[PDB]
């Protein structure tokens, strides 16, 4: 149970974005139904009044929280991967539009899931803004909690993989468009009951065997991190 508070751009806090530049849902409950329209941008997908200005190559940091800013972030039980997707904003996230910029699942070197590292990072994970065409975009940050993922939601709706989905409105101003954005995958649709990484038993199946759900990270993606960029306590 977690939500995005706001973003940072090059380590500069853009301020509380809830219902402002984040298409915030009404609460931190997960999406679980893989065929739900709620898979696109969570349960209240609509245009919010602001879009955060960035340039290609900026570091864009998403900041998550549980109940209040810079708290426990997400229950420690919620082990799983983190991904970030991008889509042109005029799509409203509909159709074959979502391109993956970032994936972090289980780190064999550190013996830690992305969610574990997100807590350590005070809720912060980042991407490099890609060199796509200037314009308005949706950045879809997705945490998958796998602590009840041994079941399919379609077999037992009390369980299932949990999707914490947050869409940020980002305007890319300066970009040389060296990597034009291709078509991508649909949400809902990309993840099905048979997709690798959706049904996974963390109690019985070693995390070293986990394969995150496709799609693969796009060749145009420039990378990212799970690391604290900014200190909310100094504000
Ligand atoms: Cu939860």
> CA-based angle 154:117:192, to the nearest 5?
20
Residues with CB under 5 A from ligand 1 (ion): 1
CA 186 to chain centre: 15
How are beta strands 12-13 and 3-9 bridged, if at all?
A: antiparallel
| Resolution stated for this PDB structure, in Å | 1.6
Please state, in angstroms and rounded to a whole number, the distance separating the CA atoms of residues 95 and 85: 14
CA of 147 to the centre of ligand 1 (A): 9
- The residue among 107, 86, 81, 108 whose CA lies nearest residue 98 is 86
Distance 126 CA to ligand 1 centre (A): 22
DSSP E strand stretches across the chain: 3-9, 12-13, 52-54, 59-65, 82-88, 99-104, 106-107, 112-113, 124-128, 135-145, 162-172, 224-226
Residue ranges of domains in the chain: 3-234
Query: 27: how many CB neighbours lie within 10 A of its CB?
Result: 10
CA of 141 to the centre of ligand 1 (A): 16
Q: Where are the alpha helices (DSSP H) in the chain?
A: 114-120
Phi and psi at residue 38, in whole multiples of 5°? -65, -20
For residue 78, report the distance from its CA to the centre of ligand 1, in Å. 7
Contacting residues for 156 by C-beta, under 8 A, at least 6 apart: none
Question: Distance between CA 27 and CA 209 in Å, rounded?
Answer: 33
Cα torsion 17, 20, 22, 28: sign: positive
> Which has the closest alpha carbon to 169: 28, 61, 47?
47
* Residue 30 CA, ligand 1 centroid: distance in Å: 7
* CATH no. for 3-234: 2.70.50.70
Q: Please state, in angstroms and as integers, the Cα–Cα distance from residue 187 to each residue in 36, 86, 98, 126, 209, following that order.
A: 9, 12, 8, 22, 25
In whole angstroms, what is the distance from residue 120 CA to residue 16 CA? 21
């Amino acid at each position: 149970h977690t939500l995005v508070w706001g973003v940072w751009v090059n380590g500069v806090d853009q301020g509380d974005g809830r219902n402002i530049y984040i298409r915030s849902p009404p609460n931190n409950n997960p999406v679980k139904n893989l065929t739900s329209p709620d898979m696109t941008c969570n349960v209240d997908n609509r245009v919010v009044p602001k879009s955060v200005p960035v340039n290609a190559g900026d570091t864009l940091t998403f900041e998550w929280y549980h109940n209040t800013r810079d708290d426990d972030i997400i229950a420690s039980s919620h082990h799983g991967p983190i991904a970030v997707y991008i889509a042109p904003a005029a799509s409203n996230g509909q159709g074959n539009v979502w391109v993956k910029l970032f994936e972090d699942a289980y780190n064999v070197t550190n013996s830690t899931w992305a969610v574990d590292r997100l807590i350590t990072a005070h809720g912060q994970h980042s991407v490099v803004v890609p060199h796509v065409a200037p314009g308005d975009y949706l950045f879809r940050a997705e945490i998958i909690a796998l602590h009840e993922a041994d079941s399919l939601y379609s077999q037992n709706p009390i369980r299932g993989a949990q999707f914490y989905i947050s869409c940020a409105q980002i305007t890319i101003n300066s970009s040389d468009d060296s990597t034009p954005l291709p078509a991508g995958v649909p949400f809902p649709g990309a993840y099905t009951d048979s997709t690798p990484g959706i049904q996974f038993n963390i109690y019985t199946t070693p995390a070293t065997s986990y394969v995150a759900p496709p799609p693969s990270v796009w060749s145009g993606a420039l990378g990212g991190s799970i690391a604290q960029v900014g200190d909310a306590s100094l504000e």
